[model samples]
Target: VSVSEIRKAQRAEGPATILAIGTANPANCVEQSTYPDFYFKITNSEHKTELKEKFQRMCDKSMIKRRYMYLTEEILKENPNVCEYMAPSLDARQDMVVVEVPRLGKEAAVKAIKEWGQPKSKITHLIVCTTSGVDMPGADYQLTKLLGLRPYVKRYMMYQQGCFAGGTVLRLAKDLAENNKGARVLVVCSEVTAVTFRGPSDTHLDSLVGQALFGDGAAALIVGSDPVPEIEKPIFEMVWTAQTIAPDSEGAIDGHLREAGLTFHLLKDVPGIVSKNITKALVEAFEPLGISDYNSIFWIAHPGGPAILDQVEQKLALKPEKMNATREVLSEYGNMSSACVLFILDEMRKKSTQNGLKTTGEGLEWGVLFGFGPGLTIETVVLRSVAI
Candidate 1:
């Protein structure tokens, strides 16, 4: 069924809930200072003055300290003229996905499945989302084999959906678990964005900003309909969901073939476009569920970038620590594409377990999981925490 159709019915089976989460990042991590030299080396255009200063300024003020990358400093330094001198062929980057995806993704999935304290064989469905790379016998297939999941397990993949793909997989996982009560769904969102690092294209400032904002990371979630057992975790009950796309933002963000690899494009106005519509969009999403008090809601927004988060905070009037989880992930890993939201959610879950940190209070059980993308699409879901 379409998302709207499902929203209308809301529940034909039972409520699907997020049971547990685990996250993974590449071992080769570095500070944001790792890029200025690399950017200067890759550019050969006449507009160096404008491009270099813009990139340097963004790098300085990104609010991001570190990001994990599959490519270490040594590897990056090897290809000084990365895009022009030694750009990975399209086929080469795509081929790398075949090898890299499973290894990076499986680590997180195993942790989550183990955390769930259930047999891997019990998982009935596998849902995968990745924007950085694609493979035919993709991460999903490799996961079933690696985890010894049932051979008959059904599989679903969500690709090229951009940052919101994390939200997309969860929505799909919720549907699968609810539709098949007592069943378990393993959902993974993994990204190897580093493979797509581009050389200076004509859109240099956008490239600089985009590069400053992305890194590699993966997150896995176990969604199920069964009651939590003794060793289980937080239950984020799938509640209400809504989305809206800007009228003419079809091309604002894109993943296309650059000489270097499958790279993502960013338009300068993305922050403005998202800020203008998100408030009204979120209001319409929450009010129908009778969520009138904004202060009561918790936010697990995707940390696309510092600028975008600032826009969202300003537009939504979010107060102290409402966006702390997102900002934390942004500071640590930049944006891991679709996997970023799950990381924020996992961080929040960890935070909720700490003392003096109540997950909910009177009328404060509500949460908003938001992911934004190229269409300037804003996907928002209302998740309520409940005792199992």
Candidate 2:
């Protein structure tokens, strides 16, 4: 159940490559406790006193019982270091760029990749995923010009896939690498849920739940046919990947881009639904590998939010310390959506390397990586580890 060993096994396998990863996080980020104080001013003037009370009540019940970080003016005031990293605003109208997340995402991706030393010519394909914004010709087109990528480079954009998009992108990268033989794929995800924040009066419990959990950040990973001899190989091989949509759960978690911002509707029944279905999902995920005892397998779960992780741990009967890495990510950086998995992976990687652990079987270790998103879908992958 050691995640570090599991990742090591996957990385040792051949035919896939993880060249480099470039990450960016908001500079103006505030702690959860600071949110209420910060938002009180903007929302205090509203006439609906009941709505304010409800907001406070809901906030109190949040998985992060204390508070959650937010991208607000207060964040800028509190942490000038974060503000310095923010991209300069473009002249394009907010409607044009914000509504088209792909465009904004591409700019962010290019900015990140350039720093990674990726000359545009080495990149053969561009893949962008996001839950925070929308755009046509999206991130792919915007990235081509912004990064000076070749005109012939292929384009693929994955949107509305929710937070699990990172795992989805990894599967896509594996498939592309397997088929294209040496194709250089750049996968990027950026989320700025704070931009869509709503006043207590405008949001119900569901929206409030999502708003309470999401934060802003961006990550870019370079996967290509060329393997880095120095870095560890992927931990687990993709033995199988599955997508499950909960019945009658469509309305439970829905997101829409509204004039006010992105509105997230999260049905309060999510924890219950996960409680009932997660065990079944885990069984199915392990069935392919003939694994009935998940207690023995390492888990790289997406830290969707604090509550979701708690629910997952309970359903799976995992150790209390199993989610320590996830909690660290949530506490330090909030949730980075798709990039959250990588952040957890990064933590696990450091933990494993620092401890100097070894794989248990055939230099192969089993890991169940999962993420939950809109459609209430859970995206999963079974990966094996490889040594560096």
Candidate 3:
């Protein structure tokens, strides 16, 4: 049988359940309406009046109302030379990522640890994920010390996969928990995107889009054996996950280290790439859940950008309301890299609680979580909201 067919038939028992989660918002939030002024205010130098105006216009058009980052307008002002920050060599960027990611990731990790109801000694594994930056004793190590996990807790580290990092880490956590009975896996995801910032000095629309649309945030999830954690109703079980890469998608989106920080390149044609190719991937995700017609499935998609979500809706023939959560997350927080999908899922949890266990798409009570990253990689997870 093919992989999808194999997945549909496996129906394994003893899998881990997604019990609960905790999140940390980065230090500074940049409201979109005033972003252009914020940008100009931090320059520490002078006039690119025309470009500054153009930048502000795009910020206005971004459909994003605000973004949180470690670096805020006021914080930059204190730095004085923050505008010339492109000067931070690659090593310097690495240094910042190492120091800041852990500090920023700490609150979210602590919240998860405290709320998971597992004594610190019972957390058998630590899985930390990120895509923005890294250094020795990264967020994983720092958080281990900062949160005071067991001295011998197994550690798995993942980074630099772009937005797909969340799916990857969650899959890893599930496997760890399922294979080791009574083990509780703590999954932490944090992005200090301000360290990835590329200034207008680069003058590339792709680079500028990175600046305009990206934000920083962190999320932590605890998954373990069923009948535990005792979270609220409609808890999720991660039934299946799969990944597929689109044909000819190479170079469509790329990121790499430069002397200062990192550089990201995004093609204007990306929306078309996803629009034409995503249905097959969606079908694979749904077939295992005994669902047909992709439109009937609930969506908790990565809020990559407005255009990406728009194309998803149009090409899939989904209702305008189907993507409202994804749209709102993008609008409110911009694209928080891998953390975007989790934020969207958290919003779903909030809505579910507020509306008495209801969800989008006819309230069917099952959904798919999805996101894409560099390599035009498409990653998905099949999830069901169940009353246990």
Once model 3 is optimally superposed onto the true structure by TM-score, how far is the C-alpha of residue 23 displaced, in angstroms?
A: 0.9
In the range 38-85, model 1's lDDT, one tens digit per residue, is: 656644444566666677678877888888888665655555434442
Better of 1 and 3 by lDDT: 1
- What shift in Å separates residue 2 of candidate 1 from its native position after superposition? 26
Q: Give each model's whole-structure lDDT.
A: 0.75, 0.62, 0.73
Return the TM-score for each candidate structure.
Answer: 0.89, 0.78, 0.89
**lDDT by residue for model 2 (1-388), tens:** 9987765543424454545556666556555654555455454424666655665665555444332233456533443322221223222223433543544355556654664464668777778777655566676676677667799988787766777777888778776755564476787776665445554535365655554566766667676654544442343344566778766676666766544555667764776666567787888888767887766666677777667778878877888776776677776766667877766665665566566767411222676677777777777877655463
User: What's the distance in Å from true for residue 160, model 2?
Assistant: 2.8
lDDT score for residue 102 of model 2 = 49
Q: How close is candidate 3 to the true structure, as a TM-score?
A: 0.89
Better of 1 and 2 by lDDT: 1
Model 1 regions more than 4 Å off? 1-13, 38-50, 77-82, 85-88, 201-203, 228-231, 360-363
- Of candidate 1, the 10-residue stretch with the lowest lDDT total is 355-364
Output the lDDT of residue 90, model 2.
22
Best by lDDT: 1
Off by over 4 Å in 3: 1-13, 44-46, 73-88, 229-234, 358-362
Using lDDT, rank the candidates from best to worst: 1, 3, 2
